[PDB]
Amino acid sequence: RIIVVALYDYEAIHHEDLSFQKGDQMVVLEESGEWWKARSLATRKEGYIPSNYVARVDSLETEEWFFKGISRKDAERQLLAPGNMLGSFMIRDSETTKGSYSLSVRDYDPRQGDTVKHYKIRTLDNGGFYISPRSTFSTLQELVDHYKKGNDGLCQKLSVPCMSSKPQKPWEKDAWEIPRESLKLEKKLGAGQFGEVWMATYNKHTKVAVKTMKPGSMSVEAFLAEANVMKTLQHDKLVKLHAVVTKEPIYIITEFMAKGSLLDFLKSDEGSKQPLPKLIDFSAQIAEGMAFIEQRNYIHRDLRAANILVSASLVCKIADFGLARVPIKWTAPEAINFGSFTIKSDVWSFGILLMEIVTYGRIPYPGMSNPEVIRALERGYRMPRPENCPEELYNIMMRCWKNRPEERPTFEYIQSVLDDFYTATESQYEEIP
């Protein structure tokens, strides 16, 4: 006997799936992935539902101010998104204290601008929870209600929970390999050598992006290999691989990033009013993605702003990764002269990418042809520092551009530095007595 409750209003797009609203409760019949067979209680109909739209009744996630599986940096990114003001808060699972919680509040001090402060949450005895040992609480709800009524030792009082967005709907069940007939490629987005990229529609609803491949050099059954491999590498900073069309020419169906490529975005009009901290935030998201790739020991072989895509909410993801196991200004000398290409050469690439982002999509090594570049690189030449670039960010680029491959940093260290670029290590969690 398992009863859940819906967190957002949902509409049926498939045939055997249910429809509900924010607040309606449902019985659970089957657990099998992101889709659960469930019986509604208001309609009493039995349909399939997205498992990330519901949560077990009165089990924390039911509350508006609780956010599961969110990191400290992520909570910082969300609380500064449009729709949030001073005091906009949230409670999340602790990232450094597994089995504990943390409170994140939006504040403003004049000498830095808008900020997000994080307080730890202690829990034992067990009489309840506390942030300051003087004021103790039984449940997290009453705890919230106290600090909501006057800032008892905080840099700001609590106003409203974070402006949570409705999650992206999960892919259709059993729909890995799909009939091509399900597609309506209604706009060409890009074309180049090996294939095209279209904005498409999968069955009337659900927008989608399709990459069509003109065959030849790329084989046939040598593609269900890389497909089934990259399908196992799910990540929030990598572009999601949804479906793949069986018959040749093979179609690759992925999520549709609403604002195209990063290079197009930076060169664009909106992506030029984007301040420096947001660019650093972008490169931190990319670093996070390259760090996940690094943990899995894989290589990208082609890293640049053109291969980074942007969602409508300014989220960066990584596109056709590993398609070099399936154009040199971003390439390290070890991979140019000797064809090395490792995770370290990708660190070099990330250095040039970092150069693109800061220069609003400018061409690396401007005024230089590829020969003029390669001849100068052996001469020990590195790109100068832009007039709007911090010396510390420049030092990161320089570290990425070491002659020795293994003297270069890791994407784990690069991400960490970039994530807390404006925050001293001691300032991460403000501790109040």
Ligand SMILES: Nc1ncnc2c1c(-c1cnc3[nH]ccc3c1)nn2C1CCCC1
């Ligand atoms: N997913 C997308 N969403 C929105 N726009 C996209 C894309 C892609 C794209 C990039 N890499 C991909 N690899 C497999 C599918 C796939 C699709 N390419 N593009 C266009 C290509 C250049 C600017 C935008």
Ligand SMILES: [Ca+2]
């Ligand atoms: Ca502190």
Ligand SMILES: [Cl-]
């Ligand atoms: Cl029942």
